[PDB]
Write a protein that holds these residues in place. Structure first.
Motif, PDB file in Angstrom:
ATOM      1  N   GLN A  27       0.815  -1.208   0.000  1.00  0.00           N
ATOM      2  CA  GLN A  27       0.000   0.000   0.000  1.00  0.00           C
ATOM      3  C   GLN A  27       0.852   1.263   0.000  1.00  0.00           C
ATOM      4  O   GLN A  27       0.417   2.314  -0.474  1.00  0.00           O
ATOM      5  CB  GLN A  27      -0.941   0.013   1.212  1.00  0.00           C
ATOM      6  CG  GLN A  27      -0.254  -0.176   2.569  1.00  0.00           C
ATOM      7  CD  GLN A  27       0.495   1.059   3.047  1.00  0.00           C
ATOM      8  OE1 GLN A  27       0.170   2.185   2.667  1.00  0.00           O
ATOM      9  NE2 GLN A  27       1.503   0.851   3.889  1.00  0.00           N
ATOM     10  N   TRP A  28       2.071   1.154   0.526  1.00  0.00           N
ATOM     11  CA  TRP A  28       2.840   2.343   0.871  1.00  0.00           C
ATOM     12  C   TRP A  28       3.646   2.898  -0.300  1.00  0.00           C
ATOM     13  O   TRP A  28       3.710   4.120  -0.475  1.00  0.00           O
ATOM     14  CB  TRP A  28       3.762   2.040   2.058  1.00  0.00           C
ATOM     15  CG  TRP A  28       5.069   1.418   1.681  1.00  0.00           C
ATOM     16  CD1 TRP A  28       6.284   2.035   1.642  1.00  0.00           C
ATOM     17  CD2 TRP A  28       5.288   0.068   1.254  1.00  0.00           C
ATOM     18  NE1 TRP A  28       7.251   1.149   1.234  1.00  0.00           N
ATOM     19  CE2 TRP A  28       6.666  -0.065   0.987  1.00  0.00           C
ATOM     20  CE3 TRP A  28       4.456  -1.041   1.076  1.00  0.00           C
ATOM     21  CZ2 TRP A  28       7.230  -1.262   0.553  1.00  0.00           C
ATOM     22  CZ3 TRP A  28       5.019  -2.231   0.645  1.00  0.00           C
ATOM     23  CH2 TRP A  28       6.392  -2.332   0.388  1.00  0.00           C
ATOM     24  N   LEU A  29       4.268   2.042  -1.108  1.00  0.00           N
ATOM     25  CA  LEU A  29       5.113   2.534  -2.191  1.00  0.00           C
ATOM     26  C   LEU A  29       5.678   1.347  -2.966  1.00  0.00           C
ATOM     27  O   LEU A  29       5.534   0.191  -2.559  1.00  0.00           O
ATOM     28  CB  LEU A  29       6.237   3.416  -1.657  1.00  0.00           C
ATOM     29  CG  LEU A  29       7.093   4.114  -2.707  1.00  0.00           C
ATOM     30  CD1 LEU A  29       6.402   5.382  -3.192  1.00  0.00           C
ATOM     31  CD2 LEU A  29       8.459   4.414  -2.115  1.00  0.00           C
TER      32      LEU A  29
ATOM     33  N   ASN B 177       8.326  -4.024  -6.733  1.00  0.00           N
ATOM     34  CA  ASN B 177       7.463  -3.809  -7.888  1.00  0.00           C
ATOM     35  C   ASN B 177       6.526  -4.992  -8.094  1.00  0.00           C
ATOM     36  O   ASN B 177       5.315  -4.814  -8.253  1.00  0.00           O
ATOM     37  CB  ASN B 177       8.310  -3.562  -9.138  1.00  0.00           C
ATOM     38  N   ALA B 178       7.066  -6.212  -8.081  1.00  0.00           N
ATOM     39  CA  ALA B 178       6.243  -7.393  -8.336  1.00  0.00           C
ATOM     40  C   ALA B 178       5.221  -7.612  -7.224  1.00  0.00           C
ATOM     41  O   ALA B 178       4.044  -7.903  -7.493  1.00  0.00           O
ATOM     42  CB  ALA B 178       7.135  -8.624  -8.499  1.00  0.00           C
ATOM     43  N   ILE B 179       5.653  -7.489  -5.967  1.00  0.00           N
ATOM     44  CA  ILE B 179       4.733  -7.709  -4.853  1.00  0.00           C
ATOM     45  C   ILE B 179       3.576  -6.720  -4.926  1.00  0.00           C
ATOM     46  O   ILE B 179       2.400  -7.098  -4.821  1.00  0.00           O
ATOM     47  CB  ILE B 179       5.478  -7.621  -3.508  1.00  0.00           C
ATOM     48  CG1 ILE B 179       6.279  -6.320  -3.413  1.00  0.00           C
ATOM     49  CG2 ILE B 179       6.396  -8.819  -3.324  1.00  0.00           C
ATOM     50  CD1 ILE B 179       6.930  -6.100  -2.061  1.00  0.00           C
ATOM     51  N   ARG B 180       3.894  -5.438  -5.135  1.00  0.00           N
ATOM     52  CA  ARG B 180       2.852  -4.421  -5.238  1.00  0.00           C
ATOM     53  C   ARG B 180       1.956  -4.665  -6.446  1.00  0.00           C
ATOM     54  O   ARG B 180       0.732  -4.509  -6.359  1.00  0.00           O
ATOM     55  CB  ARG B 180       3.484  -3.030  -5.308  1.00  0.00           C
ATOM     56  N   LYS B 181       2.545  -5.037  -7.587  1.00  0.00           N
ATOM     57  CA  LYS B 181       1.756  -5.276  -8.790  1.00  0.00           C
ATOM     58  C   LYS B 181       0.711  -6.357  -8.550  1.00  0.00           C
ATOM     59  O   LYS B 181      -0.468  -6.190  -8.895  1.00  0.00           O
ATOM     60  CB  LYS B 181       2.669  -5.677  -9.952  1.00  0.00           C
ATOM     61  CG  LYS B 181       3.604  -4.595 -10.474  1.00  0.00           C
ATOM     62  CD  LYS B 181       2.850  -3.373 -10.970  1.00  0.00           C
ATOM     63  CE  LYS B 181       3.808  -2.308 -11.493  1.00  0.00           C
ATOM     64  NZ  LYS B 181       4.713  -1.776 -10.436  1.00  0.00           N
TER      65      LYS B 181
ATOM     66  N   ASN C 237      -3.418  -6.222  -8.605  1.00  0.00           N
ATOM     67  CA  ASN C 237      -4.284  -6.992  -9.493  1.00  0.00           C
ATOM     68  C   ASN C 237      -4.990  -8.154  -8.802  1.00  0.00           C
ATOM     69  O   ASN C 237      -5.813  -8.819  -9.441  1.00  0.00           O
ATOM     70  CB  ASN C 237      -3.496  -7.503 -10.701  1.00  0.00           C
ATOM     71  CG  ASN C 237      -3.558  -6.545 -11.880  1.00  0.00           C
ATOM     72  OD1 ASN C 237      -4.638  -6.107 -12.281  1.00  0.00           O
ATOM     73  ND2 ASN C 237      -2.401  -6.218 -12.441  1.00  0.00           N
ATOM     74  N   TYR C 238      -4.695  -8.424  -7.532  1.00  0.00           N
ATOM     75  CA  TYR C 238      -5.504  -9.360  -6.767  1.00  0.00           C
ATOM     76  C   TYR C 238      -6.655  -8.672  -6.048  1.00  0.00           C
ATOM     77  O   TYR C 238      -7.700  -9.296  -5.835  1.00  0.00           O
ATOM     78  CB  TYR C 238      -4.635 -10.104  -5.749  1.00  0.00           C
ATOM     79  N   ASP C 239      -6.493  -7.397  -5.678  1.00  0.00           N
ATOM     80  CA  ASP C 239      -7.592  -6.691  -5.022  1.00  0.00           C
ATOM     81  C   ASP C 239      -8.826  -6.601  -5.913  1.00  0.00           C
ATOM     82  O   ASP C 239      -9.953  -6.547  -5.407  1.00  0.00           O
ATOM     83  CB  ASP C 239      -7.145  -5.290  -4.595  1.00  0.00           C
ATOM     84  CG  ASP C 239      -7.961  -4.741  -3.433  1.00  0.00           C
ATOM     85  OD1 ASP C 239      -9.195  -4.943  -3.417  1.00  0.00           O
ATOM     86  OD2 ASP C 239      -7.370  -4.103  -2.537  1.00  0.00           O
ATOM     87  N   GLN C 240      -8.641  -6.587  -7.237  1.00  0.00           N
ATOM     88  CA  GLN C 240      -9.777  -6.386  -8.137  1.00  0.00           C
ATOM     89  C   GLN C 240     -10.738  -7.570  -8.107  1.00  0.00           C
ATOM     90  O   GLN C 240     -11.958  -7.383  -8.192  1.00  0.00           O
ATOM     91  CB  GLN C 240      -9.284  -6.127  -9.560  1.00  0.00           C
ATOM     92  CG  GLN C 240      -9.157  -4.649  -9.902  1.00  0.00           C
ATOM     93  CD  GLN C 240      -7.893  -4.032  -9.345  1.00  0.00           C
ATOM     94  OE1 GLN C 240      -6.936  -4.737  -9.032  1.00  0.00           O
ATOM     95  NE2 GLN C 240      -7.885  -2.711  -9.210  1.00  0.00           N
ATOM     96  N   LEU C 241     -10.216  -8.787  -7.999  1.00  0.00           N
ATOM     97  CA  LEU C 241     -11.065  -9.974  -7.982  1.00  0.00           C
ATOM     98  C   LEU C 241     -11.603 -10.250  -6.580  1.00  0.00           C
ATOM     99  O   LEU C 241     -12.688  -9.790  -6.219  1.00  0.00           O
ATOM    100  CB  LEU C 241     -10.299 -11.193  -8.501  1.00  0.00           C
ATOM    101  CG  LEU C 241     -10.172 -11.307 -10.021  1.00  0.00           C
ATOM    102  CD1 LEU C 241      -9.064 -10.401 -10.538  1.00  0.00           C
ATOM    103  CD2 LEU C 241      -9.934 -12.751 -10.439  1.00  0.00           C
TER     104      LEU C 241
END
Length: 406
Positions: A383-385, A394-398, A402-406
């Protein structure tokens, strides 16, 4: 002065001189530094024999004359000094044979001989006197004749404080001259302790091992006490006191585990340290509860520069993984909250981020970051940066995105 010719000695003998007269003339009194190697003594031995022949109702000996002129203490000191110089070594051995023979003839007991040798007054300097060695050797002689019994060196040493005696033994074990002697007295003392049920904790304290801690598994005294504990437990196999019992009695969990962690760095102690850690882990299981309690016990809730130092953190995780092995039910995701009891701001995630590239901590840091992902994945945070493009962040945040949407 006088040249010691046979012809000279004949002159003296016929001149009426006796053995002590010639001793004084050759100046073999006040020559303790030199007399065993001087040829004046050999001349006097010649004269002794010839005088002995002519006066058969009286005998004189070397040992008795040197005793008349130096006491038992001087003869002992002279022999012990003489056996250092190799040229003297043979005569030195023969004189100490003669002396102990004399003592045994006179039925002198080892304790009386101990007093004759000024050793009763040696005090804490007992083992700095050379003649102590003579005394020791005499006991051996007294115990080779007279096999009807067996006399111990320790039996004369109970005037002492045991701590002071132990200091003396430790010090004298370094000096080669009084090395095997010190080991013998030490074995006697150990057997006495074992005979009176003296607990391994008692010895541990008596050796002031409850004070240092610094490289404590490296100490000589520590290894000696570990030997004593093996002995105690072998003998009293029903009432064992494993090393961990003592160490946990005398040190806080955090400090004890700190010793164990630091001492697993040097290979010399590594094995033992690991043993102890294993045992320490058992100690905690034997009581039983709260991996978060152990986190408290470890003083580990002083986070911030938390992951960086905490040499004891690996021990915490070890305990958790041991604890899981035997108590699988009763969830371990309290471990998750175990961090989050104290925290759950951006600071904790930061700490984890910096620790992810610390090889020491990388696996654990990635695991806990995964745990965050699962916790704020039940939220709608962000959430932070992420401020890199192809970084692990980058990968963890990405994929959180894209998991929050489902």
């Amino acid at each position: 002065l006088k040249s010691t010719t046979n012809e000279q000695l004949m002159s003296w003998l016929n001149g009426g001189k006796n053995a002590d007269d010639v001793f004084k003339l050759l100046t073999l009194d006040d020559a303790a530094e030199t007399l065993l190697a001087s040829p004046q003594l050999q001349a006097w031995i010649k004269f002794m024999k010839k005088f002995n022949t002519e006066n058969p109702k009286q005998q004189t000996t070397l040992i008795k004359t040197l005793t008349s002129h130096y006491g038992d203490d001087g003869v002992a000191k002279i022999i012990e000094a003489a056996k250092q110089v190799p040229a003297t070594a043979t005569i030195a051995k023969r004189l100490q044979t003669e002396q102990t023979q004399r003592w045994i003839a006179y039925e002198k007991s080892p304790d009386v001989v101990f007093k004759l040798l000024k050793l009763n007054n040696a005090g804490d300097k007992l083992f700095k006197q050379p003649q102590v060695v003579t005394w020791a050797k005499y006991v051996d002689a007294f115990n080779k004749a007279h096999p009807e019994q067996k006399t111990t060196l320790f039996s004369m040493l109970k005037k002492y404080d045991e701590q002071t005696l132990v200091d003396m033994l430790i010090a004298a074990q370094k000096v080669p001259a009084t090395e095997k002697i010190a080991v013998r007295v030490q074995a006697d003392l150990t057997n006495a302790w074992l005979s009176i049920q003296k607990s391994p904790n008692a010895i541990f304290k008596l050796l002031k091992l409850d004070m240092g801690g610094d490289a404590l598994l490296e100490s000589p005294l520590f290894v000696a006490w570990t030997k004593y504990t093996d002995y105690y437990n072998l003998m009293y196999h029903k009432e064992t006191f494993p090393v961990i019992s003592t160490l946990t009695k005398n040190y806080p969990n955090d400090k004890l585990a700190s010793i164990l962690a630091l001492a697993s760095m040097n290979p010399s102690t590594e094995s033992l340290a690991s043993q102890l850690q294993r045992e320490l882990l058992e100690n905690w299981y034997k009581q039983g509860n709260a991996p978060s309690y152990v986190f408290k016990r470890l003083q580990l809730d002083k986070t911030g520069e938390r992951l960086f130092d905490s040499p004891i953190l690996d021990t915490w995780r070890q305990y958790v993984d041991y604890f899981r092995r035997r108590k699988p039910k009763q969830k371990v995701n309290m471990l998750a909250i175990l961090k989050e009891h104290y925290k759950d701001d951006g600071v904790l995630a930061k700490m984890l981020v910096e620790a992810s590239e610390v090889s020491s901590t990388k696996t654990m840091a990635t695991d806990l970051l995964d745990a965050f992902t699962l916790r704020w994945m039940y939220n709608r945070e962000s959430q932070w940066l992420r401020v890199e493009g192809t970084s692990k962040d980058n990968a963890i945040r990405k994929m959180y995105e894209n998991y929050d949407q489902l």
